[PDB]
Design a protein around this nucleic acid. Structure first.
Lengths: 155, 144, 116, 143
RNA sequence: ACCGAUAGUGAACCAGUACCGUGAGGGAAAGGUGAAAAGCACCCCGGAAGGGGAGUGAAAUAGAACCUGAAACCGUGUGCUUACAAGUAGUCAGAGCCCGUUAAUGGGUGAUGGCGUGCCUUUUGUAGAAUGAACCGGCGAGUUACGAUUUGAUGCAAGGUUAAGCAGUAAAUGUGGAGCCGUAGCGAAAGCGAGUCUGAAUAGGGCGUUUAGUAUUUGGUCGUAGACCCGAAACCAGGUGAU
RNA sequence: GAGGGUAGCGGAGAAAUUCCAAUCGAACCUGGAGAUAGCUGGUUCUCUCCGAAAUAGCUUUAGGGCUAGCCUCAAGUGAUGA
RNA sequence: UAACUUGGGAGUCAGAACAUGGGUGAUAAGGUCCGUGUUCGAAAGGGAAACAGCCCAGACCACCAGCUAAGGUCCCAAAAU
RNA sequence: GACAAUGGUAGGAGAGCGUUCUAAGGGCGUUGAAGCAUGAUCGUAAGGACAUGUGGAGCGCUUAGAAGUGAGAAUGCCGGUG
């Protein structure tokens, strides 16, 4: 703004006597190189909503995903070492779309290490579910333990 | 879907911008008028008043005082006591728990506004004439 | 984000300068002078669309007067005579008949005289 | 849009001669002006010339009414400081009768570019003889 | 969901530098060939600068004053028109003479006729001889934070809601019930309570008994901060000057 | 002529409000500082609907302000308006 | 065919001419101060030569159609020598 | 289909155009993007396309989000030219 720009302390010329517009500083808004008025300033954009509405939104996303046949309940993911090709073949066997979200109960290291370099796949746990992850994903693949945890935690 | 989003009907509205041409209706003077104290940057007079006639809150007298030893009682009327099973016992530690009293300011007082239709024993700090008569009128007990 | 000008101010100023072609001197070159004259042209044309109807009715009546005087009578008595008969032909058609069909007009002056 | 417009490809002009003996000055000048303009034709067009030529003979013995012979005065100014001239209408009749008729008629025509051309078709002669026999002028009676 | 060379630091470049002042001190302008210098051997006009060919290169109207290259302004050549005429310069009508479109009751020019005293600001009232603008281009003015109130939407409902903190990817949301608003008023207060105050006296009178709120958020307005922008004559504090 | 001294709430003045770096009824520079301005000037895109006032009272008040009168939008009563 | 009530947002507090009822002035002022109507302000179009306030009359847009108001009909200039 | 309303300053209310960035989806481009120039084109307005030249590497569309979001005037500031 005016005060933060370097210089511009003295008056450029006398108030009257010569034929010129009256000016007070060389860093006024209408000068070239002067201060800015009503510009950007750092702030935060976050806000909140009632706890009861944060849960009604998540169940709505799960229900909409279930409505269009985008839910796939499977058995345990039995991986002993990270390997991308095995999970790619598993995804292609179950006939899954390009964008898929896979949900488990705890942090599975051998599942998350693979299936993460494939463009369009993300891994999450039961207590890490998002409104954005569910809406952005095209289909949902879950485990029975994860499904039970999701049913018991929510309501 | 993320590519088809829609806010609820009537939930949003666009802000009004002044000083952006004559066709908008707020172009030149931006709704302020012509050449006054209220048409300058920095506003005008204080919200109450300033200068001029003597203000209304200066030609009236002051009144009263405040007692430092003031006591306020959380009141429960006879209708709020029907939620309890007949024949039960009511205590100040249970009214707060069951969801009748939220804040216990300086004790519990029972007021006689409504109908009881119970036979429950209630113990509280204060009672009114109607509260004590109606409670005892159908069987019961009370203490202080 | 910062929004700058460019490709918006120039586009609308060229539209105004392009409506002033044929104007004299700097009134087809400079935007500020051309903008004023284009507004006056629209104000003139609105006024002149409604004066064009008063200008042509006068021309027809002048021609009907000259044709009628050749039959020993004036315009005022011609329109009264036609009205008392019910010809209902407007001034635009009577003028076009007197210029072209000389002896068809004489068929209408007679009936205007028959009813007096 | 059906209106006919006359133009130079089809304009016809003819010549007339009018006697100025025993007539009032203004009553004759108003009738001559309606002929020079072309107000007596069915093809009158405002922006083109349609009228005919007029010859005025016997410009003398033009008659006034009342005491206009001595009372009516014509003034002019030479655009020099303090120079204004004057002449009586009864004095102009006996020394320049052609100008008396010519100026009276020219005062009844519009002062446009077309008005000056339309006023150049009037010929005024003080006697009963005119030199325009190459054309075939016709006698005209005043309404 | 910060800037992109008038922006962003005064300074993208040899910038606290050129420059200005005795001194303290004030302070700029200036980016862009090409993928690769392959940066025009050689011939012609000239003293030279400059140019015309020939070559390099995809391209030289990319030749170092080098990407793109607008407007003001200055020139050359051409279709229609102008030396008797009184013009805020246009608009409506209209012959004649030349062209041929995003193909449609087409384009350029204009012999003549009718009508017609610029724009803004400030005013009871301005063509005004009241103010401002030489022209073109860029830049240049109701914003944000925290509170109050009112309106729309959404969730729950005699209940509604958490703050700090902790865990988590600087997230979403878990957990956290200190605290806040409402469910009951009246009175200066003690106090009483669907009723209370005044009063000897519901006698009369005043304010209450509606007894549905509460949390987040779009829009309007207000308050505290410079608070729509530019503009003083002055006051105070610490320093520099008797060339 | 050369070398020195007196500094702004001050210095110098054969006295004129005269001089103290082309400036003096109180020098210049940098800060408080975006001082304050009931006063001039300015305030950037387009359509649709409605459409004033230049009055009263009080005012350290008179070219300023506050309440009332006149305009607009939303809800309610509904015949109370001419 | 309006009026009253409760809420959100204003602007206005320099007015002028004409007719009429009065004060003041000199039965002066395009003077000044009040009461009562109109127009301008914030109103284009026709008439009064030109001429915010006088007479007629309230422009959504297009047409080379018709009837009227004020005011007019010898020529400029539309319509009775 | 029948009727009715639509001059307007201060000011109140409503519906829209265009500009830069983000998200999701779907596309164009050396067989030539943006920008610039011309044209006898389209819509009620702000404004949107198409064709041809120049140009040599990026850019539109749909639905949402957020603003350093629109210039003719301040004896306005900077550059160029009368």
């Amino acid at each position: 703004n005016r005060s933060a720009v370097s210089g511009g302390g003295r008056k450029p010329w006398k108030q009257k006597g010569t034929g010129r517009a009256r000016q007070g500083t060389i860093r006024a808004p209408q000068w070239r190189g002067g201060g800015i008025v009503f510009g950007p300033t750092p702030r935060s954009y976050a806000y909140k909503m009632p706890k009861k509405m944060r849960r009604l939104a998540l169940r709505s996303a799960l229900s909409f995903k279930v409505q269009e046949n985008g839910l796939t309940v499977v058995d345990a993911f039995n991986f002993e070492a990270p390997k991308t090709k095995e999970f790619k073949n598993v995804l292609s066997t179950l006939e899954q779309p390009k964008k898929v979200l896979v949900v488990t109960e705890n942090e599975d290291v051998n599942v998350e290490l693979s299936a993460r370099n494939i463009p369009g796949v993300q891994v999450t746990t039961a207590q890490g579910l998002n409104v954005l992850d569910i809406t952005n994903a095209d289909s949902l693949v879950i485990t029975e333990a994860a499904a039970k945890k999701v049913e018991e935690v929510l309501g | 879907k993320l590519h088809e989003l829609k806010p609820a009907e009537g939930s949003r509205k666009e802000r009004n911008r002044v000083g952006r041409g004559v066709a908008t209706g707020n172009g030149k003077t931006s709704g302020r008028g012509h050449k006054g104290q209220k048409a300058r940057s920095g506003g005008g007079v204080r919200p109450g008043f300033e200068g001029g006639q003597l203000p209304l809150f200066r030609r009236l007298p002051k009144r009263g005082f405040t007692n430092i030893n003031r006591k306020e009682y959380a009141i429960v009327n006879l209708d709020q006591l029907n939620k309890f099973e007949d024949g039960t016992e009511v205590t100040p530690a249970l009214l707060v728990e069951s969801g009748v009293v939220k804040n216990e300011k300086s004790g519990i007082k029972i007021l006689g506004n409504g109908s009881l239709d119970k036979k429950l024993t209630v113990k509280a700090h204060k009672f009114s004439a109607s509260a004590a008569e109606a409670i005892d009128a159908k069987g019961g007990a009370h203490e202080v | 984000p910062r929004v700058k000008g460019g490709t918006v101010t120039r586009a609308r100023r060229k539209k105004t300068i392009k409506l002033a072609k044929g104007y004299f001197g700097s009134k087809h070159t400079l935007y500020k002078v051309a903008k004023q004259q284009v507004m006056k042209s629209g104000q003139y044309a609105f006024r002149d669309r409604r004066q064009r109807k008063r200008d042509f009715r006068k021309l027809w009546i002048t021609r009907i007067n000259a044709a009628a005087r050749q039959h020993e009578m004036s315009y005022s008595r011609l329109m009264n005579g036609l009205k008392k008969a019910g010809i209902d032909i407007n001034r635009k058609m009577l003028s076009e008949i007197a210029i072209s069909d000389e002896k068809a007009f004489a068929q209408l002056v007679t009936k205007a005289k028959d009813a007096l | 849009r059906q209106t006919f417009m006359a133009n130079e490809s089809n304009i016809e002009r003819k010549w007339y001669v009018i006697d100025a003996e025993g007539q009032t000055l203004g009553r004759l000048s108003s009738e001559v002006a309606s002929i020079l303009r072309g107000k007596n034709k069915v093809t009158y067009t405002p922006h083109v010339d349609t009228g005919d030529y007029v010859i005025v003979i016997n410009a003398s013995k033009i008659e006034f009414t009342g005491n206009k012979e001595t009372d009516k005065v014509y003034y002019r100014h030479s655009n020099h400081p303090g120079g204004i001239k004057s002449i009586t209408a009864g004095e102009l009749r006996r020394t320049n009768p052609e100008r008396l008729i010519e100026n009276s008629i020219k005062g009844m025509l519009p002062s446009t570019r077309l008005g000056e051309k339309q006023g150049k078709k009037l010929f005024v002669y003080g006697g009963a003889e005119h030199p325009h026999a190459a054309q075939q002028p016709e006698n005209y009676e005043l309404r």
